[PDB]
Amino acid sequence: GIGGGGVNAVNTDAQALLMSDADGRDSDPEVGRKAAEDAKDEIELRGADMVFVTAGEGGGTGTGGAPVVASIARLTVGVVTRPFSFEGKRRSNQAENGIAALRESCDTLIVIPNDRLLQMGDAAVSLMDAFRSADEVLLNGVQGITDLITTPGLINVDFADVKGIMSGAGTALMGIGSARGEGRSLKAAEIAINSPLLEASMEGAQGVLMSIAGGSDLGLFEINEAASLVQDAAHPDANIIFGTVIDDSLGDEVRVTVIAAGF
Amino acid sequence: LAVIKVVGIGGGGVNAVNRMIEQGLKGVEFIAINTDAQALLMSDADVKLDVGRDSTAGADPEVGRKAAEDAKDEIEELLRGADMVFVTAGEGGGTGTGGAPVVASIARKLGALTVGVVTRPFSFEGKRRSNQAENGIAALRESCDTLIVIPNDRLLQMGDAAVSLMDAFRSADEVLLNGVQGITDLITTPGLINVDFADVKGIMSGAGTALMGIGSARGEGRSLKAAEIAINSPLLEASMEGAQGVLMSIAGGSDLGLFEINEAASLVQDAAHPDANIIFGTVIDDSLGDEVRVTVIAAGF
Amino acid sequence: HNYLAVIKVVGIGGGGVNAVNRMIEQGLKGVEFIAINTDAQALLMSDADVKLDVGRDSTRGLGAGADPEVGRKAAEDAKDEIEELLRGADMVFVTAGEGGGTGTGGAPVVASIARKLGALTVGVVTRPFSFEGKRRSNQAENGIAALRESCDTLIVIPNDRLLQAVSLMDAFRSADEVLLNGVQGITDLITTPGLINVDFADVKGIMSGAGTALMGIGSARSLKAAEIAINSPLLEASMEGAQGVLMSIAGGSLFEINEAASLVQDAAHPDANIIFGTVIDDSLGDEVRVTVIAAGF
Ligand SMILES: Nc1nc2c(ncn2[C@@H]2O[C@H](COP(=O)(O)OP(=O)(O)O)[C@@H](O)[C@H]2O)c(=O)[nH]1
């Protein structure tokens, strides 16, 4: 993530650029401008059709340097992070402006509040479990919607389906959930819509891309259970795209990742 | 006796009327209507009709509608003078979805008792399809007299375990036929109790929004159990309760009992609304030997 | 010392014959199976060792009336042919699905013919479903009544408790083999014994003169599959005084064994009597059958 707390998540400062796992150097929000902001043509976009922006708001240029990627071609949807309550008024003062161009020059954004992520863990955590125990959720809004095209499985979804509903959609939330043992797919879908993260606003939206993962074990009958919980669930006149995923490291778990759009 | 001409519009219909043919389904005449002429090469329909000048019914029911209409005559020659005319399909796409409201409408204008036997999409089959299907079902109901609908959703219970997609629509391939088989055999292969075309006419006529269930069994009280399950078939949705019009049929071997017929029938009417009009029908089918089938058809609400 | 036990199992009426073929297909051995029925349609389709036509063949749309007078008639009418069929048996199981007619009223006869001959006679039968109507539940209680006073031992199993709506259609015709597990529940101890053998004579004491009995199985590895059987509602929880209990286990291989044995007696009045046993049925990996018959009241 193009940020002094968004780099440390993916799995201007000199000692930060040199930890990017795939194979400048002189540093506040506006730091991303004459240390970060490079040319008008830096995607002459080449080898693929999307990449994501994991540039939240929990460090350095995650505010003034985040929307450097937003105007990159004014399709890409950023998976951000609104700051915790206790992380000061100064980081909260960098809230709207650090997201404003991420929802004026960028396609769509998924404003994952770690404030609300208090319900994901055990009881108490730390600042070190705000870019670690909030990587799990931070990958979700990404991985949820990549896996439909990279690794589908028992059901498939086009390139043009995601990019035909999640295109320039601006305001967007998600909602995730997990389950093992019986009822798996409907247990986790009923977690997915009730998860303190979609802010109970799916019914207001007009376009939802439900994902659902698990082994190749994953029955065709389980998938039909979750699918129903959507036709009732969202506005009864929306644009919904289902679709499945294969991940055989889950075995018995089924990663039901819902994503919202169309407010 | 009676001229039964089964028509399978849609790709799903034309695919399902093949299953009919590859099962025998006597006393009918098969007609496959679809847009991509290519797809009709694989049909074993005795008659095949092509309805597509240009489409490059590409997921748009309104092509299918127009297609059905621009071949309004082609069909009204295929359907001329025919006591019983069926119009099975897969609602969801376009060729069926749009068409059936015509082919059916055409049979009905031709005075032929017209029975629809269509399916609703799996909800995994996307959300568009549902809505496509949904106004298309509203379209038959308002066109053909009876419309047995079979929600696929319901077809896939947990007692059909790790299935597939081929197996899925194959599970439907049987079920479409079953709402046909169990109305036609009455007329086309009546066993000990005759129920002539006329009877089915009066129960089916004007009814609509019909449902159906199926149950086979054997052993002690076989016909009770085979009937019991059909009553409880999820494919009905607790509807038996209130159906003012019920068509049953206890298809079994030549030597099927009266005591048997009686107490399976007597198990149906009791579920049914107590005012409900009812009809027995037995059918001779040797492929069972030791077992019996039962196909209650709730109709009118 | 000719270790041979002559064990036969007759399936009377559709219920019995159905059940006997379910026994044939699921691979019970060491036993002559017998199908007796009124319709010769279903007899020729059965794979029973010896099939017997008793009922007068009846014109289309009669016969199938389910009047246990007519079944009782049919066997008493062909009582000779039944006497020879079960002649020099050692132990004769008698299975049926009560409520009906032919099996309802036919079992009483065949059971009581095994008795005069001098077999250990056993009745493994079922009480029809509650939805089948009052006439059958009536017609069953009388056929049960007779068979209780014909067989040395009778195992009655409600097909109503054997259900617990959509897919419990495959909870009668694939749940009736409770009858089968009822039979091999005793048979497979003598015919295919395990690491603890318990021959015919062990059984002859703990059955001859009981009258009434009940059963329950378990699937499994054997540590956690043992409780399963006694607790199974099928047994009516009537292990607060089952005065004469039998128990069996099937698979590969003492610790496994004594896991369950260190439990059995902890149930009913242990002043009575219990018999253990073992079976070699290599048709099952981690699974091991844990059948428990509970006689004597
Ligand atoms: N019974 C049956 N249903 C099918 C088959 N293939 C697909 N379906 C279902 O029927 C629906 C209708 O599609 P279809 O009739 O092929 O589209 P159309 O030919 O353009 O009307 C689909 O959404 C599927 O859920 C099949 O072979 N048999």
mmCIF file of C-alpha atoms in Angstrom, chain C residues 53-284:
data_model
loop_
_atom_site.group_PDB
_atom_site.id
_atom_site.type_symbol
_atom_site.label_atom_id
_atom_site.label_comp_id
_atom_site.label_asym_id
_atom_site.label_seq_id
_atom_site.Cartn_x
_atom_site.Cartn_y
_atom_site.Cartn_z
ATOM 1 C CA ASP C 53 -45.579 -70.190 -4.167
ATOM 2 C CA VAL C 54 -48.346 -70.543 -1.470
ATOM 3 C CA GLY C 55 -51.139 -68.216 -2.383
ATOM 4 C CA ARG C 56 -53.548 -69.037 -5.150
ATOM 5 C CA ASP C 57 -52.608 -66.728 -8.060
ATOM 6 C CA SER C 58 -55.411 -64.107 -8.226
ATOM 7 C CA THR C 59 -56.909 -62.296 -11.252
ATOM 8 C CA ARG C 60 -56.025 -58.666 -12.003
ATOM 9 C CA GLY C 61 -57.125 -56.356 -9.189
ATOM 10 C CA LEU C 62 -57.774 -58.849 -6.429
ATOM 11 C CA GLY C 63 -55.558 -60.860 -4.065
ATOM 12 C CA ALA C 64 -53.463 -57.814 -2.956
ATOM 13 C CA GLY C 65 -56.147 -57.352 -0.274
ATOM 14 C CA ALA C 66 -53.902 -57.752 2.792
ATOM 15 C CA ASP C 67 -56.289 -59.964 4.803
ATOM 16 C CA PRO C 68 -54.038 -61.951 7.178
ATOM 17 C CA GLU C 69 -56.717 -64.663 7.158
ATOM 18 C CA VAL C 70 -55.809 -65.411 3.540
ATOM 19 C CA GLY C 71 -52.058 -65.528 4.264
ATOM 20 C CA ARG C 72 -52.567 -67.675 7.349
ATOM 21 C CA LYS C 73 -54.741 -69.802 5.058
ATOM 22 C CA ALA C 74 -52.049 -69.999 2.354
ATOM 23 C CA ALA C 75 -49.415 -71.570 4.615
ATOM 24 C CA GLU C 76 -51.700 -73.835 6.620
ATOM 25 C CA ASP C 77 -52.907 -74.820 3.112
ATOM 26 C CA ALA C 78 -49.294 -75.542 1.948
ATOM 27 C CA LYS C 79 -48.065 -76.617 5.441
ATOM 28 C CA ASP C 80 -46.581 -79.820 4.072
ATOM 29 C CA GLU C 81 -44.390 -77.993 1.548
ATOM 30 C CA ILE C 82 -43.163 -75.706 4.432
ATOM 31 C CA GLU C 83 -42.443 -78.698 6.682
ATOM 32 C CA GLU C 84 -40.095 -80.228 4.106
ATOM 33 C CA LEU C 85 -38.482 -76.882 3.282
ATOM 34 C CA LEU C 86 -37.449 -76.354 6.933
ATOM 35 C CA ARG C 87 -36.776 -80.105 7.589
ATOM 36 C CA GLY C 88 -33.660 -80.864 9.653
ATOM 37 C CA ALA C 89 -33.053 -77.180 10.169
ATOM 38 C CA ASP C 90 -31.257 -76.279 13.396
ATOM 39 C CA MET C 91 -32.464 -72.697 13.690
ATOM 40 C CA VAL C 92 -35.023 -70.931 11.568
ATOM 41 C CA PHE C 93 -35.270 -67.161 11.329
ATOM 42 C CA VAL C 94 -38.676 -65.828 10.240
ATOM 43 C CA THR C 95 -38.749 -62.322 8.765
ATOM 44 C CA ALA C 96 -41.644 -60.186 7.549
ATOM 45 C CA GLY C 97 -43.003 -56.622 7.605
ATOM 46 C CA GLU C 98 -46.124 -56.741 9.716
ATOM 47 C CA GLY C 99 -49.335 -54.761 8.877
ATOM 48 C CA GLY C 100 -49.824 -56.500 5.540
ATOM 49 C CA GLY C 101 -51.546 -59.819 4.919
ATOM 50 C CA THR C 102 -49.439 -62.583 3.465
ATOM 51 C CA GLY C 103 -46.468 -62.037 5.769
ATOM 52 C CA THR C 104 -48.632 -60.872 8.680
ATOM 53 C CA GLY C 105 -50.567 -64.138 8.685
ATOM 54 C CA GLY C 106 -47.934 -66.391 7.034
ATOM 55 C CA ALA C 107 -45.140 -65.910 9.596
ATOM 56 C CA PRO C 108 -47.276 -67.325 12.446
ATOM 57 C CA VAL C 109 -47.618 -70.564 10.501
ATOM 58 C CA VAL C 110 -44.026 -71.035 9.308
ATOM 59 C CA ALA C 111 -42.639 -70.185 12.761
ATOM 60 C CA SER C 112 -44.947 -72.709 14.438
ATOM 61 C CA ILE C 113 -43.925 -75.397 11.861
ATOM 62 C CA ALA C 114 -40.225 -74.849 12.665
ATOM 63 C CA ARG C 115 -41.217 -75.430 16.314
ATOM 64 C CA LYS C 116 -42.857 -78.871 15.871
ATOM 65 C CA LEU C 117 -39.800 -79.841 13.800
ATOM 66 C CA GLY C 118 -37.521 -78.718 16.599
ATOM 67 C CA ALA C 119 -35.582 -75.682 15.447
ATOM 68 C CA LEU C 120 -34.598 -72.668 17.518
ATOM 69 C CA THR C 121 -37.207 -70.443 15.930
ATOM 70 C CA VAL C 122 -36.680 -66.679 15.703
ATOM 71 C CA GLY C 123 -38.965 -63.896 14.458
ATOM 72 C CA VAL C 124 -37.342 -60.723 13.136
ATOM 73 C CA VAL C 125 -40.265 -58.478 12.075
ATOM 74 C CA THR C 126 -41.421 -54.870 11.810
ATOM 75 C CA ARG C 127 -44.433 -52.842 12.919
ATOM 76 C CA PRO C 128 -45.824 -50.787 10.078
ATOM 77 C CA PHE C 129 -45.560 -47.006 9.807
ATOM 78 C CA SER C 130 -47.956 -44.825 11.624
ATOM 79 C CA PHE C 131 -49.194 -43.272 8.356
ATOM 80 C CA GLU C 132 -50.170 -46.682 6.901
ATOM 81 C CA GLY C 133 -53.464 -46.475 8.797
ATOM 82 C CA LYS C 134 -55.236 -47.993 11.690
ATOM 83 C CA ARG C 135 -56.263 -51.211 9.917
ATOM 84 C CA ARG C 136 -52.617 -52.240 9.366
ATOM 85 C CA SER C 137 -51.396 -51.081 12.773
ATOM 86 C CA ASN C 138 -54.323 -53.255 13.934
ATOM 87 C CA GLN C 139 -53.503 -56.093 11.521
ATOM 88 C CA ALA C 140 -49.875 -55.896 12.636
ATOM 89 C CA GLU C 141 -50.581 -56.128 16.380
ATOM 90 C CA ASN C 142 -52.450 -59.390 15.838
ATOM 91 C CA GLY C 143 -49.803 -60.916 13.544
ATOM 92 C CA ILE C 144 -47.175 -59.835 16.095
ATOM 93 C CA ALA C 145 -49.310 -61.332 18.886
ATOM 94 C CA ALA C 146 -49.359 -64.712 17.075
ATOM 95 C CA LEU C 147 -45.638 -64.675 16.166
ATOM 96 C CA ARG C 148 -44.726 -63.807 19.799
ATOM 97 C CA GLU C 149 -46.528 -66.999 20.824
ATOM 98 C CA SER C 150 -45.044 -69.019 17.943
ATOM 99 C CA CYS C 151 -41.360 -68.121 17.930
ATOM 100 C CA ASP C 152 -39.147 -68.959 20.850
ATOM 101 C CA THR C 153 -37.922 -65.388 20.460
ATOM 102 C CA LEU C 154 -39.489 -62.370 18.681
ATOM 103 C CA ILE C 155 -37.699 -59.145 17.726
ATOM 104 C CA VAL C 156 -40.211 -56.373 17.030
ATOM 105 C CA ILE C 157 -38.979 -53.178 15.461
ATOM 106 C CA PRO C 158 -41.206 -50.124 14.882
ATOM 107 C CA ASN C 159 -40.722 -48.619 11.442
ATOM 108 C CA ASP C 160 -42.083 -45.426 12.998
ATOM 109 C CA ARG C 161 -39.222 -44.834 15.446
ATOM 110 C CA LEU C 162 -36.988 -45.907 12.491
ATOM 111 C CA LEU C 163 -37.818 -42.479 10.964
ATOM 112 C CA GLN C 164 -36.754 -39.147 12.533
ATOM 113 C CA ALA C 165 -39.637 -36.011 5.876
ATOM 114 C CA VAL C 166 -38.011 -35.160 2.500
ATOM 115 C CA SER C 167 -35.271 -37.850 2.312
ATOM 116 C CA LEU C 168 -36.756 -40.268 4.918
ATOM 117 C CA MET C 169 -38.273 -41.827 1.856
ATOM 118 C CA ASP C 170 -34.821 -43.567 1.758
ATOM 119 C CA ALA C 171 -35.556 -44.370 5.447
ATOM 120 C CA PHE C 172 -37.813 -47.310 4.891
ATOM 121 C CA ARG C 173 -36.660 -49.511 1.995
ATOM 122 C CA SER C 174 -32.992 -48.740 2.840
ATOM 123 C CA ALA C 175 -33.893 -48.708 6.601
ATOM 124 C CA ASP C 176 -35.740 -52.122 6.636
ATOM 125 C CA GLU C 177 -32.342 -53.962 6.675
ATOM 126 C CA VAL C 178 -32.603 -53.394 10.394
ATOM 127 C CA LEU C 179 -34.241 -56.809 9.902
ATOM 128 C CA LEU C 180 -30.940 -58.053 8.318
ATOM 129 C CA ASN C 181 -28.746 -56.590 11.062
ATOM 130 C CA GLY C 182 -31.268 -58.323 13.333
ATOM 131 C CA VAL C 183 -30.613 -61.719 11.711
ATOM 132 C CA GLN C 184 -26.787 -61.680 11.202
ATOM 133 C CA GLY C 185 -26.813 -60.030 14.625
ATOM 134 C CA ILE C 186 -27.056 -63.670 15.709
ATOM 135 C CA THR C 187 -26.131 -65.620 12.508
ATOM 136 C CA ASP C 188 -22.672 -64.181 11.834
ATOM 137 C CA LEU C 189 -21.514 -65.321 15.316
ATOM 138 C CA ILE C 190 -21.944 -69.015 14.435
ATOM 139 C CA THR C 191 -21.239 -68.907 10.667
ATOM 140 C CA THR C 192 -18.229 -66.525 10.521
ATOM 141 C CA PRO C 193 -16.814 -66.321 14.081
ATOM 142 C CA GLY C 194 -13.955 -64.056 15.122
ATOM 143 C CA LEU C 195 -11.258 -64.118 17.777
ATOM 144 C CA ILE C 196 -13.931 -65.099 20.346
ATOM 145 C CA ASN C 197 -16.173 -67.853 18.963
ATOM 146 C CA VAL C 198 -19.576 -68.527 20.587
ATOM 147 C CA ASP C 199 -21.315 -71.477 18.895
ATOM 148 C CA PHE C 200 -25.033 -72.297 18.429
ATOM 149 C CA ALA C 201 -25.270 -73.691 22.005
ATOM 150 C CA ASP C 202 -24.417 -70.296 23.616
ATOM 151 C CA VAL C 203 -27.279 -68.790 21.627
ATOM 152 C CA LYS C 204 -29.738 -71.670 22.259
ATOM 153 C CA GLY C 205 -29.732 -70.918 26.018
ATOM 154 C CA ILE C 206 -30.185 -67.126 25.668
ATOM 155 C CA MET C 207 -33.163 -67.388 23.254
ATOM 156 C CA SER C 208 -35.264 -70.586 23.724
ATOM 157 C CA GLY C 209 -38.237 -69.462 25.829
ATOM 158 C CA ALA C 210 -37.632 -65.687 25.995
ATOM 159 C CA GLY C 211 -40.685 -64.628 23.967
ATOM 160 C CA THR C 212 -39.922 -60.910 23.511
ATOM 161 C CA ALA C 213 -36.769 -59.006 22.446
ATOM 162 C CA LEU C 214 -35.272 -55.734 21.046
ATOM 163 C CA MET C 215 -32.144 -54.664 19.029
ATOM 164 C CA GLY C 216 -29.696 -51.819 18.350
ATOM 165 C CA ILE C 217 -26.485 -51.453 16.262
ATOM 166 C CA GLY C 218 -23.483 -49.111 15.936
ATOM 167 C CA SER C 219 -21.023 -48.065 13.200
ATOM 168 C CA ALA C 220 -17.390 -46.965 13.851
ATOM 169 C CA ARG C 221 -12.275 -46.720 16.248
ATOM 170 C CA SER C 222 -14.280 -49.203 18.412
ATOM 171 C CA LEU C 223 -13.577 -47.152 21.559
ATOM 172 C CA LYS C 224 -15.998 -44.406 20.438
ATOM 173 C CA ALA C 225 -18.392 -46.874 18.712
ATOM 174 C CA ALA C 226 -19.951 -48.829 21.589
ATOM 175 C CA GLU C 227 -22.249 -46.412 23.430
ATOM 176 C CA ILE C 228 -23.994 -46.025 20.012
ATOM 177 C CA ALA C 229 -25.870 -49.360 20.237
ATOM 178 C CA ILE C 230 -27.402 -49.344 23.745
ATOM 179 C CA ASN C 231 -28.506 -45.747 23.501
ATOM 180 C CA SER C 232 -30.222 -46.344 20.086
ATOM 181 C CA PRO C 233 -34.004 -45.587 20.727
ATOM 182 C CA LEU C 234 -34.846 -48.773 18.738
ATOM 183 C CA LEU C 235 -33.973 -50.608 22.016
ATOM 184 C CA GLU C 236 -36.809 -48.652 23.850
ATOM 185 C CA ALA C 237 -34.156 -47.854 26.518
ATOM 186 C CA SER C 238 -35.369 -51.242 27.879
ATOM 187 C CA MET C 239 -31.893 -52.039 29.207
ATOM 188 C CA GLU C 240 -33.091 -51.235 32.762
ATOM 189 C CA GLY C 241 -33.857 -54.996 33.023
ATOM 190 C CA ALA C 242 -33.231 -57.049 29.870
ATOM 191 C CA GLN C 243 -32.861 -60.455 31.558
ATOM 192 C CA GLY C 244 -30.660 -62.205 28.910
ATOM 193 C CA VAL C 245 -28.513 -60.015 26.590
ATOM 194 C CA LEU C 246 -26.403 -60.952 23.496
ATOM 195 C CA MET C 247 -23.683 -58.766 21.954
ATOM 196 C CA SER C 248 -21.490 -59.029 18.849
ATOM 197 C CA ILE C 249 -18.565 -57.338 17.003
ATOM 198 C CA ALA C 250 -17.325 -57.623 13.358
ATOM 199 C CA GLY C 251 -14.064 -56.730 11.536
ATOM 200 C CA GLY C 252 -10.303 -57.457 11.704
ATOM 201 C CA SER C 253 -9.183 -57.505 15.367
ATOM 202 C CA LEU C 254 -8.955 -57.774 22.180
ATOM 203 C CA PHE C 255 -8.404 -54.238 23.370
ATOM 204 C CA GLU C 256 -10.922 -53.213 20.699
ATOM 205 C CA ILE C 257 -13.097 -56.032 22.047
ATOM 206 C CA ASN C 258 -12.803 -55.439 25.807
ATOM 207 C CA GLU C 259 -13.362 -51.676 25.203
ATOM 208 C CA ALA C 260 -17.056 -52.485 24.602
ATOM 209 C CA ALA C 261 -17.188 -55.463 27.009
ATOM 210 C CA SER C 262 -16.079 -53.034 29.762
ATOM 211 C CA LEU C 263 -19.520 -51.329 29.359
ATOM 212 C CA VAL C 264 -22.169 -53.955 28.370
ATOM 213 C CA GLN C 265 -22.901 -55.306 31.879
ATOM 214 C CA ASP C 266 -23.140 -51.666 33.025
ATOM 215 C CA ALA C 267 -26.731 -51.407 31.836
ATOM 216 C CA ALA C 268 -29.362 -53.958 33.101
ATOM 217 C CA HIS C 269 -29.585 -56.299 36.168
ATOM 218 C CA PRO C 270 -26.187 -58.131 35.938
ATOM 219 C CA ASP C 271 -27.561 -61.035 38.072
ATOM 220 C CA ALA C 272 -29.137 -62.307 34.765
ATOM 221 C CA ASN C 273 -26.723 -63.385 31.937
ATOM 222 C CA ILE C 274 -24.719 -61.940 29.011
ATOM 223 C CA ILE C 275 -22.923 -63.663 26.116
ATOM 224 C CA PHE C 276 -20.168 -61.941 24.063
ATOM 225 C CA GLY C 277 -18.836 -62.817 20.597
ATOM 226 C CA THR C 278 -16.744 -61.766 17.568
ATOM 227 C CA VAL C 279 -17.096 -61.764 13.757
ATOM 228 C CA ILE C 280 -14.617 -61.651 10.808
ATOM 229 C CA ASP C 281 -16.473 -59.597 8.186
ATOM 230 C CA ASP C 282 -13.647 -57.860 6.294
ATOM 231 C CA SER C 283 -16.088 -55.600 4.390
ATOM 232 C CA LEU C 284 -15.351 -52.621 6.628
#
